[PDB]
Design a protein around this ligand. Structure first.
Ligand code: HEM
Lengths: 255, 255
């Protein structure tokens, strides 16, 4: 409660957005915001957590996702009498995000800040839905991610990417669960009108995307409807969710 | 006792294999080996150094790559009287690795250990080149990687992967410098006998690779000549190079 280690990028952002950023002594590899966290010790990926990395920081509590691991590590943290708080991550919905914000605010003893955060976020998102309902034509999109050292995969149902694409007003053409690698034919069958990828993938040259199977045969490619977004903003549901949704919405229906 | 902070996984490994590990009080996020570094605080990246994070560890010296940055962070450290030591990470040759080992060993006052490490690695690699020389033709190969959220890219000349394929006795079919994304057409046309990828990217299911443009139509994929290597051993030239080289040499010429 006094010294906190957070494993989960968007969780770290929520904690700082609620005014408890003071108690954070360690964060995970997926944490890259806000700026103040850059000087803090980072432990492994929330799925490849290091008990030693964490324990060396003498934390009072650890806050992370329920799908975070390895499991034995969490057992090791509890064994050292460390309070381990875990929150449901998927499937990603606004309802679950609001419940998580409130649970966190409860754990951090800052209930009023949690409620204000939920209110501010919902106001912004509803305004996007209003504007969305004012669009004359629907948009079939797809999100492709190359997170870490994996092959390119398409975001499906239950993913944060999918939740965000939907909030933005687009229809996700992918119907499978979570993330999966698509052969060129599958991507061509999906037939997305617009394709979203991370800025890290493009890194100044859309031609780098040519190694993604089937992408150049897509209508999105031919019609040059490829959008880029910072990966940290599309893989977690944090206090910057409205900003990303508004940005994406803008690129889906420009000018 | 001297307090050292190392930025660059490869350098960290060299320093520990050199017997100067006890003096390290902090490392960066690219550092994941050896196991005893887990208790050390991992702050920043060598491409994105944290002035505040590093100074909070009260280091006497900081060791990193000549191109680590931002440059102004290095200036800050020196201004705070921290001895900053930098080594060239380019080119990825044995001659430069050995020179770096000796520069390190000198700076750390462990010249004998430095020379022993070079000798150990070299003899190991020479044995392999002896076996390779035996055959009359090197196996045509290619290495495909996905790092930092990039699309799949083929390793070209100058890359560490290229240096390791060569030492193992393979002929890198790629002729471009460093990494580039290949279209299905370019990948199929390169027509290598074998294709090396990381274990991280396969993660238990070869079908995950289906999203790499053209790999499914290569001779290597059909002949089932797809080898796996741990990504953590092909992005830097460290103490374990002989290990991955020998490991790979075995797969290029099974039995
Ligand atoms: C090959 C290894 C990796 C795999 C397989 C992987 C996979 C994923 C997946 C599927 C998600 C879920 C996003 C969604 O629901 O749409 C995720 C979240 C995340 N990943 Fe990775 N990832 C890997 C490496 C990394 C690395 C190297 C970073 C870089 C820092 C990174 C940063 C993120 C971030 C920022 C999140 C958000 C977590 C949160 O907000 O709580 N990932 N990753």
């Amino acid at each position: 409660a006094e010294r906190i280690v957070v494993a989960g990028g968007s969780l770290t952002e929520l904690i700082y957005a609620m005014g408890a950023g003071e108690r954070v002594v360690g964060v995970d590899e997926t944490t890259s915001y806000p700026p103040e966290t850059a000087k803090l010790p980072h432990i492994g990926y929330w799925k490849q957590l290091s008990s030693e990395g964490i324990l060396s920081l003498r934390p009072d509590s650890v806050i992370t996702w329920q799908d975070a691991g390895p499991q034995i590590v969490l057992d090791q943290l509890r064994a050292q009498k460390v309070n381990v708080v875990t929150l449901p991550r998927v499937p990603a919905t606004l309802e679950q995000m609001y419940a998580n914000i409130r649970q966190l605010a409860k754990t951090l003893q800052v209930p009023e800040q949690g409620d204000a955060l939920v209110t501010q976020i919902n106001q912004r998102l509803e305004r996007v839905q209003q504007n969305v309902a004012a669009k004359k034509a629907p948009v079939k999109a797809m999100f492709i991610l190359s997170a870490g050292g994996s092959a390119p995969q398409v975001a499906g149902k239950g993913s944060v990417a999918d939740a965000i694409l939907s909030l933005a007003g687009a229809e996700n053409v992918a119907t499978h669960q979570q993330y999966k690698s698509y052969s060129a034919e599958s991507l061509i069958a999906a037939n997305p009108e617009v394709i979203v990828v991370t800025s890290q993938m493009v890194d100044g040259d859309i031609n780098r995307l040519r190694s993604i199977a089937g992408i150049t045969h897509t209508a999105a490619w031919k019609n040059q409807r490829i959008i880029t977004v910072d990966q940290n903003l599309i893989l977690g549901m944090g206090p910057r969710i409205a900003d990303v949704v508004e940005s994406l919405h803008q690129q889906l229906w420009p000018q």
